[PDB]
C-alpha cells in the first residue's frame, strides 16, 4: 500500500532541507519512489552546491519508515550563539525565512565561541543528517558574522570525515546572493556518532530524519 512521494514544484534538496515553500500538507512516512519535475522551481533557496545529490535521491527513493526529530534543539543547543538567522533569498509569504531543518549560527555579544556538538544515533534506524558551510562574498561579512578569518568546520562520523576551510568568494548574484552555502549530508548507521566542531561558517543541523529503507 505505497504511493509515490509527490514533491510538487520542489526538489529533493528543497524538501529535505526544509525550503520554506516546500512543506507538504500531509507529511508522509513511507513511499515507493519520489516524483519531481525536471527543473523544480524550489530547491536550495540560498544558492550553493548540494553534494552527492542524485545519490541522496536514490537513497531516499524507497523508504518504509521516516521520522523527523530535532537532533540539536534550537532552544538549548546554542546558548552562546545567535540562532535566529533568516534570509530574504529564502522568503515565505513575503517575509525572510530559512530552511526549517537547519540553523544559521552567528556571533552573540560580539563573539563566536568555538563550538563542539556530538550526536549518537540511538534511533535503532539510520539517521540522515544535513548541514551546510557558508562562504561569505567578502572578508567584512566573514568577520561580522563569525569574528574569525581562519574559519574551520570539521564533521567526523565513523564512516565520514571532512574538514572544511570555507574561503571568501564573490560569485555571480543568484537570488540576490553573491555568497554561497554548500550543503552536505551523511547517513548515520545505528550506534554511530557524528561530531561537529567549528569556529564559524556552520549551517548546523536542527532536524534530522530517522528512516528505514524497506
Amino acid at each position, epitope marked *: 500500500a505505497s504511493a509515490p512521494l509527490q514533491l510538487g514544484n520542489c526538489s529533493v534538496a528543497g524538501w529535505i532541507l526544509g525550503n520554506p515553500e516546500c512543506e507538504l500538507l500531509i507529511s508522509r512516512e513511507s513511499w515507493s519512489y519520489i516524483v519531481e519535475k525536471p527543473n523544480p522551481e524550489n530547491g536550495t533557496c*540560498y544558492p550553493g552546491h548540494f553534494a552527492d545529490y542524485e545519490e541522496l535521491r536514490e537513497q531516499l527513493s524507497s523508504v518504509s519508515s521516516f521520522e523527523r526529530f530535532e537532533i540539536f534543539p534550537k532552544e538549548s543547543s546554542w546558548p552562546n550563539h545567535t540562532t535566529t538567522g533568516v534570509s530574504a533569498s529564502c522568503s515565505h509569504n513575503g517575509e525572510s525565512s530559512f530552511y526549517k531543518n537547519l540553523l544559521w549560527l*552567528t556571533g552573540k555579544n560580539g563573539l563566536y565561541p568555538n563550538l563542539s556538538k556530538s550526536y549518537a544515533n540511538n534511533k535503532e534506524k539510520e539517521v540522515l543528517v544535513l548541514w551546510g558551510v557558508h562562504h561569505p562574498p567578502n572578508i567584512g561579512d566573514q568577520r561580522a558574522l563569525y569574528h574569525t578569518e581562519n574559519a574551520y568546520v570539521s564533521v567526523v562520523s565513523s564512516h565520514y570525515s571532512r574538514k572544511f576551510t570555507p574561503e571568501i568568494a564573490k560569485r555571480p548574484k543568484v537570488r540576490d546572493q553573491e555568497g554561497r552555502i554548500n550543503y552536505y549530508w551523511t547517513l548515520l548507521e545505528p550506534g554511530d556518532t557524528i561530531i561537529f566542531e567549528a569556529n564559524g561558517n556552520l549551517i548546523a543541523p536542527r532536524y534530522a530524519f530517522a528512516l528505514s529503507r524497506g
Partner: antibody, heavy 133, light 100 residues
Framework: QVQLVQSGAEVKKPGASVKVSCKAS????????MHWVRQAPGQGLEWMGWINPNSGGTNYAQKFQGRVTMTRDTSISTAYMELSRLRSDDTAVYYC??????????????????????????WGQGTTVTVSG | SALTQPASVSGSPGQSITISCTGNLVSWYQQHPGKAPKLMIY???KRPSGVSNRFSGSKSGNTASLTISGLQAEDEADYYCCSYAGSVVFGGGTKLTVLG
C-alpha cells in the same frame, strides 16, 4: 574606527522645521538600527525614535510622533531626522546613536530576524539646534 | 513607564559608589559635560569591549545598580540608566561628583 558624523549647528524660527544629518563610517550602515536622542540644556537624555536603515521602518517616541520624521539614504550611509513645528523648548543638542545589535549583513543575505533593544554603543558628536523667535 | 535615579551622588577618590535605577536588560551611559554619552553596561552587567571592569552592573528586586570601584576624578560625569518596553526609556540621570 566606527564613527557617526553629524551635521552642523542650526538656528531656526518657531514654527520652522530642521533636518539633522548623521553620516556613518567604519561599518556597514544598513547593519544596525539608528536611534535619535536629544538633550535640552541642563536636562536628561530623551529618546526620539529609531529607524531601521535596511528597511526604512521607523518607531517614534510618544512625545514626538506626529512631529518627527526619520529617513535614510543608504547609498551615502546617512540617517536623517526632521523635526517640524519647532518651539523654543526644542532648543537642544540632538544625537544620532547606533543600536548595538547587528541586525543585517546584506551582502551575505543574513538577517537576525528578531529585534530587541539592548543599548546604543556608538554616538555622533551631537548637533545644536537653537529655536528662537 | 519611567526609571528613577538619584539626582546626585558623591565619593572620594578610591572609594566605590553605587547608583540605583528603580522601575534585567538595563543599560548604563556615562556623559561628561558637552560630550556625547558613552555606553558602560548593557544587558544588566556586560561591558562593551574596552570599558573598564571597575564598572559593573547588578540587579535586586525592581532595582538595577551601577557600581564604580576605585573612583577616579575622570569618573565625575552624569550617569543614565536605560530600559525598554517597546519604547526606549532613559532614567532622569545622576550627577556623580568625585570630591576634590
Amino acid at each position: 574606527q566606527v564613527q557617526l558624523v553629524q551635521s552642523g549647528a542650526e538656528v531656526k524660527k518657531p514654527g520652522a522645521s530642521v533636518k539633522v544629518s548623521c553620516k556613518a563610517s567604519g561599518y556597514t550602515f544598513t547593519g544596525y538600527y539608528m536611534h535619535w536622542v536629544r538633550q535640552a540644556p541642563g536636562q536628561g537624555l530623551e529618546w526620539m525614535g529609531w529607524i531601521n536603515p535596511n528597511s526604512g521602518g521607523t518607531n517614534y517616541a510618544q512625545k514626538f510622533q506626529g512631529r518627527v520624521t526619520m529617513t535614510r539614504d543608504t547609498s551615502i550611509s546617512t540617517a536623517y531626522m526632521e523635526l517640524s513645528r519647532l518651539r523654543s523648548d526644542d532648543t537642544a543638542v540632538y544625537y544620532c546613536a547606533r543600536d548595538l545589535t547587528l541586525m543585517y549583513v546584506h551582502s551575505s543575505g543574513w538577517e537576525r530576524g528578531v529585534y530587541y533593544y539592548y543599548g546604543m554603543d556608538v554616538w555622533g558628536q551631537g548637533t545644536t539646534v537653537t529655536v528662537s523667535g | 513607564s519611567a526609571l528613577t535615579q538619584p539626582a546626585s551622588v558623591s565619593g572620594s577618590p578610591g572609594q566605590s559608589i553605587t547608583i540605583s535605577c528603580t522601575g534585567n536588560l538595563v543599560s548604563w551611559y556615562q556623559q561628561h559635560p558637552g560630550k556625547a554619552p558613552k555606553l558602560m553596561i548593557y544587558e544588566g552587567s556586560k561591558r562593551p569591549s574596552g570599558v573598564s571592569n571597575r564598572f559593573s552592573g547588578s540587579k535586586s528586586g525592581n532595582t538595577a545598580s551601577l557600581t564604580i570601584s576605585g573612583l577616579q576624578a575622570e569618573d565625575e560625569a552624569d550617569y543614565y540608566c536605560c530600559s525598554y518596553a517597546g519604547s526606549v526609556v532613559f532614567g532622569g540621570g545622576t550627577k556623580l561628583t568625585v570630591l576634590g
